[PDB]
Design a protein around this ligand. Sequence first.
Ligand code: GCP
Ligand code: GCP
Ligand code: MN
Ligand code: MN
Lengths: 166, 166
Amino acid sequence: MTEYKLVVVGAPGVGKSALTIQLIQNHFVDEYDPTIEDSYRKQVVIDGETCLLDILDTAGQEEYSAMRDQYMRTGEGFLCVFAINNTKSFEDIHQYREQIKRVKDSDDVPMVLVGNKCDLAARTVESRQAQDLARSYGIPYIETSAKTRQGVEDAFYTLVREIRQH
Amino acid sequence: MTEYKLVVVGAPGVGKSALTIQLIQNHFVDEYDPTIEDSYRKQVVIDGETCLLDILDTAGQEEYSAMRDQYMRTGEGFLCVFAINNTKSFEDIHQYREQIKRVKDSDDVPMVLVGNKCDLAARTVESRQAQDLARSYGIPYIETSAKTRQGVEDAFYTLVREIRQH
Ligand SMILES: Nc1nc2c(ncn2[C@@H]2O[C@H](COP(=O)(O)OP(=O)(O)CP(=O)(O)O)[C@@H](O)[C@H]2O)c(=O)[nH]1
Ligand SMILES: Nc1nc2c(ncn2[C@@H]2O[C@H](COP(=O)(O)OP(=O)(O)CP(=O)(O)O)[C@@H](O)[C@H]2O)c(=O)[nH]1
Ligand SMILES: [Mn+2]
Ligand SMILES: [Mn+2]
């Protein structure tokens, strides 16, 4: 069957693992549990196509930039995640986007900008900010909450459909 | 607030009204009740943006082609719906797509191809068929069921995001 190699990137603590586990294992992880590198494989049907989601859940931090080049090379689609209560993670988006373009030799990689934790009342990043950035990148913006599961399938399936029209 | 003028088009009986009512009024209509022209207005929040969905639910049939030019002129985004157990409705898609391009003076209008009734076991249109068409049109393909509500918000929000990157 068709297999989609999806990579989840973002600053440490934005909810990269929480999004993925919510998709795969249908529960919200509210535990401190930092990632090095986890792979998830799952058979799904998306718009009637049977396919495998091969998800690479990555680490945020300079520790990883080595592991990073390698895993971005083989990713077909990238979830670029920031947290809506973390302005620094929002500004860090540019850095991940540039490393991806570098390793992919591409101005246009299938990519979704994900504003996570949208359930929290204390936003420091306005949706309009993130939406303007997304439009300047030429990619969709999707807000998510791993906590309530709002936007979680949306973000992943939208990325799979981006890879399909690439 | 931002307002998105969305038009739902398709052959008669594909589930145009069922999709819209499911979105708006959270119930599946299993009654014979043909449409001439219904408008739905609803305040939503999509990816943190407060906006109004202004939905034009249209009639299928040559009766309407007059009413059709007029309403396609002002639509910003179009849901092009066929039913997965109706090959004729699938072939009719081309005709709607061409009339839209004609009235819009545009090779590229925000548009999603929607394969409806995906809950029915008796498919006569393979997902792969519809997916190839979607890629040749350069638009997303989304399968839906107004009955189970699978893919309904997906189809509408995806169209709103298409209008946003247009
Ligand atoms: N309320 C809220 N908190 C969330 C959400 N998603 C993640 N969190 C919380 O943020 C913290 C970090 O989540 P985690 O999924 O581990 O993030 P990470 O980005 O993968 C962390 P690391 O980069 O080290 O791998 C956890 O306490 C988690 O419960 C969300 O949408 N809502
Ligand atoms: N099982 C199933 N039947 C559906 C689905 N959506 C629509 N139907 C059924 O198809 C029939 C037509 O639905 P309707 O929403 O009225 O279609 P329409 O395309 O708007 C018809 P008209 O063009 O005349 O306005 C109804 O009996 C409805 O219950 C669906 O996803 N699943
Ligand atoms: Mn993690
Ligand atoms: Mn109708």
